[model samples]
Each structure stands twice: as structure tokens, then as C-alpha cells.
Target: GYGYYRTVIFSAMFGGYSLYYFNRKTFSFVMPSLVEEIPLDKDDLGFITSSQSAAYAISKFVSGVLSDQMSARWLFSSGLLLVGLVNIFFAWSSTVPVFAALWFLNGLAQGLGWPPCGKVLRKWFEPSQFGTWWAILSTSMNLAGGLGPILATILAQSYSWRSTLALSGALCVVVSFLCLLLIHNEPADVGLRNLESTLQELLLSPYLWVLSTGYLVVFGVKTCCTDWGQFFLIQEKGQSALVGSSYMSALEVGGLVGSIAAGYLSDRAMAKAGLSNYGNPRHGLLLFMMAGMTVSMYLFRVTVTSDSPKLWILVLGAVFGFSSYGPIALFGVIANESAPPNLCGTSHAIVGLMANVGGFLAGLPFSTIAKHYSWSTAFWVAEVICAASTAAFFLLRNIRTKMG
Candidate 1:
């Protein structure tokens, strides 16, 4: 049955990407510990993350092109292994320059993670099924992001930050080897040839630009939250790193549920509207999510104070996560729908580049805003970005509504 193959592929992809998150985010969770030991200031931390994003933004753009022409199995596994090695070395380094160089390399490796997953799904799944499958796989990130803090906290507390990083690095090595054995580029490797379109055709689609603009906003705000949320709690709210981890976990929990719900909502909307398999219900669903995200960001900003209850912050964090990730869950689905089969990888990669651009901006610029101005200033900027994203979706829906 196609079900059997899909199940097998899904599991492998899920496991592979989950491990990717473990390696990628381990650094973020351990940042507080690193600050204590290395005596690095906020700006130094910002520089490290910015360097990583700079490398990541460029590598993702390049790898998007490479993933189209190369074997996904090779690209994904090799990248994982390389990143794992980088993480292991990061534990041994003490200098900012060394940390910057290694993490930048790690960011380059991290870029190899997502495009192939998109390629594989486009190969195996029908358009109608893409939303659900993408959502299911999206949970791997949330699961890893949620659990990673606790794991890092435990290891850092029990042993040291170095030991925690070493453990995550070893896990990445194991997953990398497993991916090499398990993942094939497409069903064609098992006797199926997938239909796809040319790069030129995908490049010319107006839908690509319209959706990409909104997705860029989604990525910007999402990265800002994930990267800065714990720090905000520590600096502004006086939460211990261990306590902040719990709130971070709650955020991921909300995101996991939201992504799944968004997938089903989009699928149901398509069916109810009597649209064909190729029809995009993401337009309406995405707009709704963005509006909620704007309000949630405001709620989160106002709710957090030095004396606020932890539960209050946690509840708002979860709300913020749910609203933030819902539309992002559909980013690839919308891109896949916009591009032809062959162009799916590149199409998603281009959109991803915009997302990385957002990440890059959020890194240095966001950190500077918080450091020089105030955390409240940073929060307000994110709220405005959310508003812009919601407006972009409304514009797209209007275009589609009139054309259809």
C-alpha cells in the first residue's frame, strides 16, 4: 500500500529533522550557561547568533539550488554529520572567534536540512495530502524545541554545558548515519518517477512573491520569539533558566497543536468550498492565523512583567506559539502549489531564503533594539511585523477572490 511507504518515509523524515532541531537549537538553550561560564555579554551572544544566521541565509539559498540537482539522501545526511561535528567542537572552544567560526559552519550545515524534506514529500504525497503530512512533520521541530531545553538543562546542571553539547552531538551522528541508510531521493528510487516543473516556470509565478512576503514576516517574528523568548524571561522577568525552559516548552506545545490544527482547517476549508485538490485554502487560514498572532504578541508583551505570575507568561507563550506557527506550517504547501513538480525544491528554497532574510534581520537588529532601546521596543517592532504579514495575506486573498 502507498500508506506503508508513506509511513516509512514519514518516520525517517521526521526522525532526521527532529535530530536536526536537537543540534540546531541546543546552542540556544545552552546560551545562558555559556554566558555564566564564558562571561559573554548580550551583544556577544547577538554577534554569535547573527554570524550563524548570516551563514545560514547564504547557505540555504545555495543549498536550495543544489538540492534540486543532487540526491537528497546524500545532501541531508552529509549536512547532519557535518553539523554534529561542529557542535562537538563548539563544546571545546572558549573564545568568541572560535565560537563564531564553528557556529557559522554549523549554520551552513543546518541549511542542508529542510529543502530535501520538501522535495521528498512533493515526490511521494499528492497535493491534497501535503498539508496534513507537512503539519505532522512540523511537529518534529516543536517536539525537539520543547524537549531540548529540559534535556540541555538537565545535562548542564548535572554535568556541564560542554557535556550537554557533546551528548547532542553524538545524537546527531547517530541520526545522520540512520538517514544515509534510510532515505531515498524519491519514490523513483523504489520504482516511481514523479512529475515536476521547470525552474523558470516557478520563478515567474506571482503567487510566489505574494506568499513569500507574508512568509518572510512569519519567519522574522517566529525566529525572534524562539531566539529571544528565554532571554527575555531571564532579563526582564527574572526567571531562572530552568524555569524559562518550562515556558519555552509550553510555547512549543502550542505550536505543535496549532500546526496540526491549521493543516486540518485548510483541508476542510478546501473541501467545503468545493475546490479541486490543487485549490489553496491556506489563504483564508493563514490570514486568520496572522491576525491572532498580532493580538497574541501584544498580549504577551503586556502580560509579562517582573512581578507577573509564571503561569500567566506560560499561557501567553503558548498562545504566542500557536498563533505564530499556524501560517508558517502552510508555507511549503503554498509554495508547492505555486511551483511545478521539479521546481518544488527550488520554489520552497526561495521562500526559505526570504525566511532566512527575516531571521538575519531579527538577529542583529532585534538584539540591538532590545539592548540599546528596550525589550518593549523590540516587542512593539515584532507586533508591527505581524500586522504587516496579516495585511499581505488580505491582499493575496483579495487577488484570488477576484480572479477566481
Candidate 2:
């Protein structure tokens, strides 16, 4: 009976979150076509995306607090429902003000996706097992993000951009209803109340702030790759929108592989260390991954269009994806393990809020830099941030070691 519910809950959360990405990324994949059909320029697109990211960042914090206090069933379902409605409305609209409003709302709705899932993960798994389980759960986003481009591309190619958005909205609706029926808040829903931890303690923790700072750059770079990579390919590398979309898929495929390795490798390191403290293993893996991510980002940027085979772009995307996501997936595990057990959802959300702010910055900063200087200049900025992230991780490692 225990095994049965675990399987059901895991499936529901994973599948539900996976569909969230399907809706989240629909606009990104359709963006290229929108440029042509909707006739929106790069600056306009940047402003719209930034607006959405700001809303998402705010909602991540707000919804995270609510997810901790309220019913996951309602919080998660309502998010999906709202996002689906927004997307359906987006499909019919063409004006920038209207798109801005819908996408901003979509961002807020997207906020509903993660915190409850984090809550469920904390309830279901042991702290020692969190790395592996959360990593596995992280793959759902990567898989969906990877497939989103292809799905959006196909729908756009076969019919129209509006049709693609409509289809994604419809799918989100179905998944939202399914989650309402299937997902439970925690084991407590059956009979057990969860343990308590003060949000004040988490707020006071230095480690949380350290991780948040590091996450800002980690997610900023990742968002730059995800949100602007296709446009970069189309404009700089002279690739078609469809081909650009495929490279975007390649990035997520790389992320999927990276996510798996992140969890398993960290867990192995922890077990071997046999340390009771979570800090060492978390810091060690972070330093290693961020360094690798820095190297990969530089390589990816330099090779953007070196007169090599187009396939090389995908290859580099995979490498960058692998390096970036290894650290990305590790953030949630680190937050949960380090925070007071009761505040796992809030802990993850705090870090997530920082990351989303990074993502929000990615839209306009990079786009404006690309417009004024060059795309190469923007790429260089990403590399610098990646390097800075590695430095931050190094500091965190020392801080952890000193504290112990």
C-alpha cells in the first residue's frame, strides 16, 4: 500500500510538473515565428519577456509562502488553470500591451509549479536521499523543456503559431484537472502532521544567502541560453527558426543528462564522506560543477558560428546544458538539506526567487547589450557571470568548512 501511493504521488507530481514546462516554453519556441507573423522586434520581445520574468520572480516568493500554508491541491491546480487560460488568451491576441499582460499573468501562474512539488518531495523522501530523488524530479522539467521546442515547432509548422499556443493551453487544462484529483499535499494528508520550523531561522541563515547569490548567476546564464539561444542562432548563425528550436531542444537534452549526474554524484560523494553535515558534499559538488559550467559557457559562446558544421552548435549546447544544469538541479537539494526541515518549501522558494530575478535580468540586459554592442559582447557577459558564480561557490565552500 505504501509503495502504491508513493508511485502514484511521484507520477502525478512528475507528470504534472512536466506539463508545466510545456506551457512555460510554448511562447519561447513560438517567438521566432512571432517576430515574422506578429512583427515584433527584438527590443519589444525583450521588454515583454522581462515583464513576464519580473512577475514570475514575485509570484515565486508569494506562491511559495502560500504553498507552505495552504493546500497544495488547490495552489498547484489553480496555477495550471490560470496559466492555461492566459495562454489561450495569448493565442488570440497580437498587440504588445495585450501580450505583455497575458505573458505577465502567465509568469505569475508559472510560479505555482515548483514550491508544492518541493513540499511533496520533502515529505516523501529522506534528507540523505533528497539529492537523487529531487534530481530525478528535476528531469521532468528538462524533458518537457527539451520536447517543448519540438512540439511547438511542429504545431507551428503544421498549422499556425496561434494553433500551437492553443494546443499547449488545452493540454495544460487537462493536466491541471488531473493534478487536482491525483496530487496530495504530503504524507500528513493521510494522518501525520509535518514537523515545524521557523521561517525566521531560514531568513537568518548565512548559507541560504550564499546559495541565493550563487543561484542568481547560475540561473541567469541558464535563462539566457534558454530564452535567447534560438534568437541568437537565427540572427547570428543564420539558421532557420526550426533548426534553432532543435538546438534549444539539444540544450535541454544536455540538461536532462546533467540533472541525473548531479544528484547521483553528490549522493555518492556524501555517502563516501560519511559526514553527518550536509554542507561538505553540497559545497564540493557546487564548486566542481560551476567550474565546469564556466568552461562550457566560454566554449559555447566562442563556437557560436566558427564556420564549423551546424551540428557542432548542438554538441556545444549539450555540453553547456550538462554543466549548467548539474548545479541547477543541486540547488533544491542543498536548500532542503540545509534548512530547517519544516521550511523546505520556503527554503527552495527563496533560492528560486533569486534565480528568477536572474532570469528576469537575462531578458533585457543581454538583449540590450546585443543590440548596442554585439551578441558577442552579451556572450562575454554570460561568461563573466559564470566565472563569478564559480568564485562564489569557492567562497561558499570555505564558509562551510570554516563553520564546521
Candidate 3:
């Protein structure tokens, strides 16, 4: 029956999404330890990490466009192979440049993972139920977000950082094999019926850009937080290395909760609209996310100077976590819902490309800024960028017109 077909779709989607998180977040946990072992400074670490984002952005530009016309099965399988290979190579590197090259390679693989995954979701789920279903599958990554960091941190603390990364690489190898066995391009291709025509109809709407831009903002802030939050905690806040790791975990945990909430709310909003108008009810949730993030960034910049109690610090970290991580999953869902059914993968890739560009730029001019100014200035800059991203929502007003 279509039930089992959809189940396979869900498994592949969830597994691939979870492994993506597992591959990336391992670095966050290893950072506190890596700096001590290598010649990497905050700026250098940021740059090394940015190379992957840069590579990912480039990959997205190409992959996003290709996903529209190509077979998602082959794209995803090839990506898994490359991702595993790069992670294994990364584990063997000792120099920063070598490490950077490996991550850059991995970025191309990371870019391969998303748009096609979006393509898979479109084949099995009707547009009407897409929000809730997509959200449920998106939770795979949030599930990783909640669990991966903790596992990475615990393992790094118990063993060497190298061991932590090596093991994650090993896990990736297994995931690659499982992907080969399970993932398929579409239900009809595998002898199942199409879910609905509304999936294709939504492509005619112009609101796609609005949704994609919102998603880019969501992911950009997330990558920025992953790259810099720990250093900010250790240096600006005078926290112990352990406390900084805890803070990262708290952020991911909040993100896990937020991703689920955004999906549920998006569904309810759409259910209320009942096709009465062309307006995407999901936009309402995006506005709420924007307000929450704006306030959180403000609090971050304002409170970086405080010597607050441990409880207060955790609470603040959680608040910022909730604001940033909660709506993260909605980005891809929005991109797919808005783009043409044929172009959903490409749209997700474009949004990912922009988000990674933001990551690459996150800590740029690093040496100059750290030398001439304070870390506080960096936070100020991030605040400005995030605020600007929130405002970028207005650029999307014509999305329905364009996509429609």
C-alpha cells in the first residue's frame, strides 16, 4: 500500500536529515578541545569552518538548479558517498589548511543532501498535509540537534577530539549504505499514486521567495551561532570551557522544540485559511519568529557584558536557543511549498546557498576585527545582520507573483 511507501520516504528523509546534523555538529563539540590542540584561534577556526559553508553555498547554486530536472535518488546517493569520504579525510588531517579543504569538500556533499530530500518529500506527501508531515520529518535533524551535540560533547570529553570525529565519520559510512538501500525518487516512479495536484498548483504562487528568504535568515543565524557562540561564551562571558559546551547543548535542545512547534503552528494556520485566499498562513508564523529572534539578538548584544548567575546564563541561552532554532525547519518546508513542484529542490538549494554565504561572511575580516576592536563588536555586527535578515522578509512580497 501507499502507507509503506510513505513510511520508506519518511525513514530515508529522517535518516538523511539526522546524519547531516551528525556530520556538522560534531565540530562544535570538538571546538573547545581542538583549539587547545591546534594553532587555531577563534578567527582561524571561523575561517576554516567558513570554507565548508563557502563550498556548500557554491554546491547549492549548482545542485539546487539541477534538482529540478535530474533524478534525486542518484544525487542523494552520490552525495552520501562523498560526504562520508570527506569526513573520513577530515579525521586524518593535522593542519588547518588541510582541514579546511576537507570541510570544503564536505560542503559540496552537504549541499547535495537538502534539495533532493525536499524532492523526495514532495513525491509522497500531498501539499495539503505537507506542513505537518514535513515538520515531522524535519524533526529528524532537530532530533540530531538535541542529541548529536550532547553525544559529541560527551565523547570528546571522554576521549580525544580526533576520536570523536573519527567515530562520527565511521557512522556516516554506515548511513551512506543505508541510504543506498532505502531512498527512492518518487512514489509514482515506484508504482504508487500521486497524492494531490495542489502540490503542483502551489508552485504557481509568488510567495515562494518570501518563504525562502525567511528560511535563509533562519539557517544563517543558526550557522553563525554554531561557529561563534562557544568562543563568545568563553572569552566575553568568562565562562569555563565546560560551561560553554553546556550552552551549545542548551541552544540545540531549544531548537529541537522550536522546529516541531513551527510545523504544528504552520499546519493550524493553513487549516484555518481553508483555501479562501492565496495568502500562505505560514507567513504569520514567520513574522512571529522574526519578532522573537529580534528580541533574542538584542538581549544577546546587551547582556554579553553581564556576569550573571549560572541559572540566569542558562535561561538566557535557552531563550536565544528557542528564538533561533525553533523556526529553522520551516525554511525548507516553505521553500518547497512555494516553488514549482519541479523546482522545489532547486529552490531549497538557492536558499541554502544564501544561508551558507552568510555563514562564510559571519566571521570574515576576523583578524582585523579581533585585533582592532573587541569581541563585543562581532556580536554587534551579527545583531545587525540578523536584524537586516528579518527585514529581508519584505523582499518576498512579490514571491507569489513571480512563482505563480
Candidate 4:
């Protein structure tokens, strides 16, 4: 009974969370449409993007703690409701200040997305299969991201950009309602108790910080490419916008595979390695994933040119995506296993905050680097970040503290 029900919970969460990205990614795909149709300049759009990212970063930390304290089912559904409303309102708006505020609201609502996931995943699942489940769940976002753009492009083709947002909002609304009815907060609600959290072990432990650092760069690199990949393709690599977005899709494609691969393999690595979680050589396996980012990123930086084949760029982008995206899913597995299970969402949130910080830095601040210097310099800077975060991760493979 417990196993079958957990499967039900997992399916609901997987489908519901996947739709959240429909709203999350709508803005980026619609950007060119927004600029062309809404007639907004880059300056206004840049500010809107940055504002949303700031709210997103701050809300994740707060909502994560809230996910632990409150009804995660309600928190999860309410977020989707607000996000849907924001998208609907965005469909009607035509002013900069209005766009800015709605996107900021959307960011606050979007932060509600993941903390509930952290809370519920540990409750519904076991440690041994966590990597498998978490990675599978991780695939939802990548799948949505991979498909969202193409779908948005189609909607915009037939209807209006405004209609695409309206449609995206409507889907989220439907999913939220289904989830509110179907999803449970934990095993206790269904006459089951998780066979399992504390702060000092998490807060005081330097290992959490190490994981946080690892997450920072992982998110940063993913953001770097997501934010700029298409721009680089069109601007420097002489590719058409269609080809560039395909590269973007390839990144998401690689990410879908990488998240699952890393998640599954990390669990196997730990199952065999002899505790302190730090002593487990699984972290070593994860370090190689980061090296994937470094090596692929360096290859992308040095070898790609305007004369390069589109296929080459696509392959490199997928490789880069495969390498970097894997660890993002694995870090949560590591963090959840290491922290007290009661504080599962909190520990996951701590690391997530670092990720959004990386996401934020990858936004306006990193863009300014490309604005003045060159995309080449920005890639070099990312190369440095990848190298350093990997080094930091490498240094942590041998800690044996009793707390883990």
C-alpha cells in the first residue's frame, strides 16, 4: 500500500511541477516577441528580468523554511495559482512598471515551486532510491524547458504572444487545481510515518557550505549558458535564431539525461563506498561531473567560431549541458541524505539559496561583462568559476565527522 501510494504521489508531483516551468520559461522565449510587439526596449526588459531574479532568489530561502513549517500542499498550489494569475495579468499589460511588478510577483510565486518538493520527496521516498526519484523529478523541469520554447513558438505563431502567456497560465491553473486535490503533505496524513531533521548538524557543518559552494557554480554555469547561449549563437557564431534556439533545446535535452544519469549513479557510488557522507567517494564521482562543465566549457570557448558547423555547436552545447546539469540534481540528494530528515526542506533550501544567488549573478551582473568586453571574456570568466568550484568540491571528499 505504501509503495503504491508513494508512486501516486510521485506521479502527481512530477506532472504538476513540470507545468510550473511552462510559466517559468515563458518570459525568455517570449522575449523577442515582447520586444517586437510590446515595443519595449532592452533597458526596460533588462530591469524587469533582474527584478524578477532578485525576488526569486530571496523567496526561495524564505519559502523553503515555510515549506517545512506549513502545509506544503497548500504552499505548492497557492504558488501555482498566483503564478497563473501573474501570467494572465502579463497578457493584458503594456507598460514597463506594470511588467516589472508582475514579473517580480511571478518570481515570489515561483520560489514556492521547489521547497515543497524538497519537503515531500524525502517524506514519500527512501534514501537508497532518492537519487533515482530526485533525478527523475529533476527531469520534469528540463523536459518542460525543452518543450516550452517550441510550444510557445507555436502558440505565438497562431495566436498572439499575449495568448501564449494566457494559455500557459491556464495550463498552470488546471495543474494546480489537480495537485491541490491529489497531493498529500506527507506520509502521516495517510496513516503512514516516514521511517525518519536538525539545525546544528546542518548550520554548523562546514560540509553544507561545501555543498552550497558546489551548487553555486553549478547553477551559475547553467544560468550563464541559458541566459546567453542563443545570443552567442546568433551574434558571434553566425547561426540563425532558429538554429540558436535549437541549441538551447539541445542544452535542455542533455540536461534531461544528465540529471537522471548523475542522480542514479551517485546513489550507486554511495551504496558501494565505505559514512560521514563526506568519506563516500560518491562526491568524487560528482567532481568529475563538474569537470565535465570545465572541459566542455573550455572546448566551447576555444574551439567554436563563426565558421564552426552548427552541428559542432550543438554537440558541444549538449555536452556542456550534460556535464553541468547532472550535479544540480545530485547536490540535493547529497544534502538531504546528510541533514536531519526533519529539516529536509531547510537544508535543501540553504543550498538552493546559493543556487539562486548564482542564478542572480548570472543575470544582469554577468551580462554587463559581455556588454563592455566580449562574450569570449565572459566564457573565460565562467571557465574560472567552474574550475574553482570543482577544486572546492575536490577538497571535500575525505571529511569523516560523526555528524556527516
Best by TM-score: 4
Candidate 1 CA-lDDT value:
0.80
Clashes of each: 5, 0, 9, 3
Q: How far off is residue 275 in model 2, in Å?
A: 4.5
lDDT of 2: 0.78
Can you write out model 2's per-residue Cα lDDT over 1-404, one digit (the tens) per residue?
Answer: 56777788889888888888888877888888878886776787788888988898888888877776787778889988898899999999979988888889999999888887777777776656678878777777767876777767877888778887787789888988998998877676776544444666557667778878878888888888788787777788777667777787888777788888888888887777756543466667777778877887777667656365768877887878888888877876777666665665677777877876787798887889999997878988888877876876675564442111
Model 1: clashing residue pairs? 188-192, 196-341, 196-342, 197-341, 197-342
Candidate with better lDDT, 2 vs 3:
2
lDDT of each: 0.80, 0.78, 0.70, 0.80
> Candidate 3 at 314: error in angstroms?
2.2
User: What alpha-carbon RMSD in Å does predicted model 2 have with respect to the real structure?
Assistant: 5.1
Please report, as a residue range, the 10-residue window in candidate 3 with the lowest summed lDDT: 395-404
Q: For residues 291-342, what per-residue lDDT tens digits would candidate 1 score against the true structure?
A: 8888888887876677877788788888888888788877767776556556
Q: Rank the candidates by lDDT, best first.
A: 4, 1, 2, 3
Clashes of 3: 9
lDDT of 1 at 94: 93
Query: TM-score ranking from best to worst?
Result: 4, 1, 2, 3
Q: On residues 1-404, what C-alpha lDDT tens digit does candidate 4 reach at each position? A: 88788877888888878878778778888887777875766698789888998898788888877676788889989999999999999989888999899999999999998878777877777666678877777777767877878877877878678888887789788988999998988787779886722565557777777788888888888898888988876787677778887788898788778878888888787676664433655576588888878999888878887788889988998988888788877787777667665676777777877876787799887899999998888979988978987886677678753242
